[PDB]
UniProtKB/Swiss-Prot annotation, chains A, B, C, D, E, F:
Organism field: Escherichia phage MS2 (Bacteriophage MS2)
Gene Ontology MF terms in the entry: identical protein binding; RNA binding; structural molecule activity
Keyword Acetylation found: no
Effect of E76A: No effect on the organization of the T=3 capsid, but with a loss of thermal stability. No effect on infectivity
Protein known as: Capsid protein
Annotated spans, Viral RNA-binding: 31-104
Recorded GO CC terms: T=3 icosahedral viral capsid
Protein's GO biological process: negative regulation of viral translation; regulation of translation
RNA sequence: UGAGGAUCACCCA
RNA sequence: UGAGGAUCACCCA
RNA sequence: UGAGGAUCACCCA
RNA sequence: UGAGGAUCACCCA
């Protein structure tokens, strides 16, 4: 059994879907990368640690590239013009049962659901108003 | 027009749904809180700032309480036994168009989609394996 | 295959069986915990290392909790009254064949079989005599 | 009771089973060995002591011979290439009743039961994957 | 995908082929071993890491047993007289696409193809002349 | 004989095959380069040395360039945008027979055969999982 | 290595 | 800890 | 010796 | 910056 598998990061119908596959699990930090040039790839990392006596803490990171070609002196390379960096930390007390954690997960999916305030603000280069 | 409205943070079918409503927008930090005792309420905040010359940065926070009653000296109060703290920061270059931002949003929804590695690890009090 | 699967740690004859499932493989330590809050879960860990040029060493640990509900600060928390710890290390020479290794597994199974001296002493808060 | 008795360590289904018999009781440490030279013998020892004010601890040790290509009664050097050593330590809080102790024994029987991850890994000269 | 699977390491044309199977995944380093004692086993391990800012590096190691005059399941010392070690390091710039990577794999397949200089020298216990 | 001959390093099915030819043996390092300017050529080197009293070590290196044309000082020069480097060392005991050595060659050929885990990961900018 | 300890992937000698 | 920064498992207070 | 590094017959620890 | 902590728009390096 494993949850260290590939998954669809960006679902674009069933085509142009961005799939991220396992790449490295060194030092408790799991990493997933999309295919083709590592320079234009999406990246996801995740780790868990006991942050304190009562807390466990997850550190998730995501990088979404702006795929581009760089031309210098006539030599062109596949690059990412830029990248967005998502950094999230989730602190969960050791008293949380499985039920409690499932609720925490729903809260996270609800926050980002289409039409809700936050994903709407981001998707439109906006803030709250 | 406004995106500073109430929304369903936790969708539990159509009942037992947790709804978070606008509460305060002081200093560029929008806040949403669920109803009833502020002590047992869910909380969501969000703000955007130009973190640097080329970047705009969102700071989103969520608190999911473990609803409980505290009894001290026979006097009982509605409290949260504990809370999970989600803290996320999203950095987006000013070169991102609306299309680019929509993709960033899909990447975030995909990361947390049911069945994918991360939401599965959290929901089960686990790490990656 | 993938031997990293769930199993029933305590067999209470199909009813109240304690099954344990894969939950982390960070740092090369396979972990399995029961479906509980991390404060009340059974935990099993295993790691193998080439301890010497000519040996391999398996380190296995099991934690069996005595679950309770404790009132802290007027609030009830799921807790473990106490925990019992099993720590085992098994050193096997690199010259051991798979059949030599199956011999070690059977010896460990016979050692703890119901009715034999050791599991009888333990279950009765007794020594060998 | 009087549990210090001979028992079947390796059950090969009646034919070629390995029986281990009491061989020493110096200092309260019970010892059992198979009918072999001490260099090629199966050996089991067991002792209990109150490790600290809140715990009792069982120290169980098992030595298993490398059987493939073994010369019965011969001088096989180095000793370390021809022997596997198992060392178990069971720490049990003084509050554990006979029932609590019976469950701990079941947890140990389950951990090593045939077909489960740990015994499968060992028998196949493997780790977890 | 999910490439962590059993494969034929030495193809002797169906009869007496050596198959190597997954045996460890501690730390993200995939391991595969043949069905032998660890002293006589065929072993393969593989890992990837971003070596520096511009490169990714694959570390592949293979251990091959000295088979002539081998005693199956026996204790053969010194270990160094009975084993060959292959250590490969593949450094790939982050700009390499899947296509670039496919060509690199072909360069490796050609270098070792039957009848070419390098494999002929090795197989004949020779150098270049 | 004289195993110092040319061979096709990259087999693109008779059309666009990259063949490499003997080009230097100075200092006991056999070298082979493709028909290009030295700035754009593929390069393969091999040397064998009695690394210890009881071993022999082959050091093999392959360089696969990504060719480009670069404008330096207003003038175009044939250049390599980047290079991928393979470095392999193979240590073989002096006790290895020619058939023991043919076993090592086949193992290396099986390891990289199309379809097997390792060449599949590399070609897909993926790790093993 | 220890019938050393633990609050158990930590500490001791 | 931080609506602290980042070129993102770095760095700052 | 190193799942140490490289601009790759060089450098590091 | 930090797989730095938090009682979470705080605090640390």
């Amino acid at each position: 059994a494993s949850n260290f598998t590939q998954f669809v990061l960006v679902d674009n119908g069933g085509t142009g879907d961005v799939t991220v596959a396992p790449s490295n699990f060194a030092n408790g930090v799991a990493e997933w990368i999309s295919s083709n040039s590592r320079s234009q790839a999406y990246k996801v990392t995740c780790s868990v640690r006991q942050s304190s006596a009562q807390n466990r803490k997850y550190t998730i990171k995501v990088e979404v590239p702006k795929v581009a070609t760089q031309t210098v002196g006539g030599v062109e390379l596949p690059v990412a013009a830029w990248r967005s960096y998502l950094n999230m930390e989730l602190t969960i007390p050791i008293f949380a049962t499985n039920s409690d954690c499932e609720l925490i997960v729903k809260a996270m999916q609800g926050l980002l659901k289409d039409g809700n305030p936050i994903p709407s603000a981001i998707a439109a280069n906006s803030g709250i108003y």
